[PDB]
From a paper:
There has been a long quest for the structure of the poxvirus DNA polymerase holoenzyme since it has been shown that processive DNA synthesis by VACV E9 requires a cofactor composed of VACV A20 and the viral [name] (UNG), D4. The polymerase E9 is a member of the DNA polymerase family B possessing DNA polymerase and 3’-5’ proofreading exonuclease activities. E9 on its own was shown to be distributive under physiological conditions, adding only few nucleotides per binding event. We present the production in the baculovirus-insect cell system of the VACV DNA polymerase holoenzyme, which consists of the E9 polymerase in combination with its co-factor, the A20-D4 heterodimer.
Numbering used by the authors: 1 to 218
The structure:
């Protein structure tokens, strides 16, 4: 790990070596825009905005990406709900239960799966207001997702409206699946074959599949 100083809260960013190439730009861009982020109470809190930068990238094959943190109770870990109450993670767990045949579990966390990096495209929102910080994160969000997609083989984005033009934010032709959000009407996430397709796409690329059952909390 390594640390660098910013001129605004949270003052210090700690990062895994694999993120070094973006850190100079990140510090510059965060110093420019952070006053707009810090006007508001946020999800997550400022001290948690950057905790996913402690994750390695060189062992990652899939990025599972949502647009922004939970509007309340974000932890800094995308999708994480320690008490297993947020609808998104319960719906994801239900999909994985059907795919894997694991019926008995207590929770689910995308951040304990080998080869998967869960991601929030925007790293904060004003508390209670989805997508409220989009304009502020936009340059950082592009910088970070382009860095991720130098490493992963498949990008899976959740939310058709929010990610329809995600290609335009990238600099490579990385394999990208854009599926329904867990809260899409007519229970369209339930029927979505996106999780299953990821391992088909990895196998076609001669990459080891994801063991989705690793996310269960027993």
């Amino acid at each position: 790990m390594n640390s660098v100083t910013v001129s605004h809260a949270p003052y210090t960013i700690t990062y895994h070596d694999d993120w070094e190439p973006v850190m100079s730009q990140l510090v510059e861009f965060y110093n420019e825009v952070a006053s707009w982020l810090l006007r508001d109470e946020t999800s997550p809190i400022p001290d948690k905005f950057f905790i996913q930068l402690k994750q390695p990238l060189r062992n990652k094959r899939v990025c599972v990406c949502g647009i922004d943190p939970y509007p309340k109770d974000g932890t800094g870990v995308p999708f994480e709900s320690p008490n297993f109450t947020k609808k998104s993670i319960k719906e994801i767990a239900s999909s994985i239960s059907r795919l894997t045949g694991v019926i008995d579990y207590k929770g689910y966390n995308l951040n304990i799966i080998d080869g998967v990096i869960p991601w929030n495209y925007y790293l904060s929102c004003k508390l209670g207001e989805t997508k409220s910080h989009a304009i502020y994160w936009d340059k950082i969000s592009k910088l970070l997702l382009q860095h991720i997609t130098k490493h992963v083989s498949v990008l899976y984005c959740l939310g058709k409206t929010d990610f329809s033009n995600i290609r335009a934010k990238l600099e490579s032709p990385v394999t990208t699946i854009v599926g329904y959000h867990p809260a899409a009407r007519d229970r369209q996430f339930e029927k979505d074959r996106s999780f299953e397709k990821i391992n088909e796409l990895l196998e076609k690329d001669n990459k080891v599949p994801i063991n989705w059952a690793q996310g269960f909390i027993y």
